[PDB]
């Protein structure tokens, strides 16, 4: 920018999207990466492999195409994340993928975080991933119990119209239950 000697960071560092030092350590395993990403409204889970001209995504799952299986609730929460993980995990298995390492990008390794939920789901789908059980949420929160109880302190629906008034961690079970057998795209 300033001169011939100036040093311009790599594009993905400029965009503040890729942590290259973490990326290298990640690529060390020689295993596929379980890319866990979030958005204000959604949660994505991809299984990426290394390629000659860039990464190759062999299997993915988005919290949006979750409804495609009977999801009638918001998609930016814990239950959402886990399921998206399991969905991508399953599609992963179908693709012949057996193991991966968790890439959480620029997100924080906070216990009970959605990225770990994503990790828990992918694992249950059958994917073999280096993890640590007590950094994961306690199942109930994964189910969405923390939100149901939050609506108990109602007075006004936590969900604007949406579905239910007292929410359903049960809707969660029905869905996980569904994903664990047959159905298309899995």
């Amino acid at each position: 920018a300033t001169g011939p000697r100036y040093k311009v960071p790599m594009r993905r560092r400029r965009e503040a999207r890729t942590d290259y030092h973490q990326r290298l350590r990640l690529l060390k395993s020689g295993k596929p990466r379980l890319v866990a990403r979030k958005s204000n409204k959604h949660v994505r889970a991809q299984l990426v492999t290394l390629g000659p001209n860039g990464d190759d995504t062999l299997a993915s799952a988005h919290s949006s195409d979750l409804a495609e299986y009977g999801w009638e609730a918001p998609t930016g929460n814990m239950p959402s994340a886990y399921l998206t993980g399991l969905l991508a995990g399953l599609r992963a298995q179908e693709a012949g993928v057996e193991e991966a390492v968790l890439d959480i990008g620029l997100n924080s390794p906070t216990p009970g975080s959605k990225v770990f939920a994503i990790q828990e789901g992918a694992i249950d789908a059958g994917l073999d991933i280096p993890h640590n059980d007590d950094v994961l949420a306690d199942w109930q929160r994964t189910r969405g119990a923390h939100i149901a109880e939050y609506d108990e302190q109602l007075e006004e629906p936590l969900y604007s119209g949406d579905f239910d008034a007292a929410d359903l961690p049960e809707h969660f079970d029905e869905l996980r239950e569904t994903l664990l057998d047959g159905d298309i795209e899995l």
Binding site: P4, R5, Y6, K7, V8, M10, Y20, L24, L27, K28
Partner: protein, 95 residues
């Protein structure tokens, strides 16, 4: 030379042009080579580890197995056969 350490007279070859300065891309540090492939040896000034003796910068050897993640490349110094322990970060496929 006034001294005989490995970095004697390496000011040039072990320095980056101002623009290539800073941590290098990970793609080439993870590159995989097969036994028999021809690889060019060239130290990446930005990459500390996996280096080999500066005297071999410029050599083109043959991958013959590895040690840990590091590769074992056979070269011929003058008329002498030598084996060099080096990481992908400092290797490039010939042709």
């Amino acid at each position: 030379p006034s001294s005989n350490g490995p970095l004697e007279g390496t000011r040039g070859k072990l320095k980056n042009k101002p623009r290539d300065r800073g941590t290098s891309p990970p793609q080439r540090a993870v590159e995989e080579f097969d036994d028999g492939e021809k690889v060019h040896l060239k130290i990446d000034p930005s990459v500390p580890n996996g280096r080999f003796h500066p005297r071999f910068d410029g050599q083109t050897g043959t991958v013959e197995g590895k040690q840990g993640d590091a590769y074992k490349v056979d070269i011929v110094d003058g008329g002498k056969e030598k084996t060099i322990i080096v990481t992908a970060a400092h290797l490039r496929r010939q042709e």
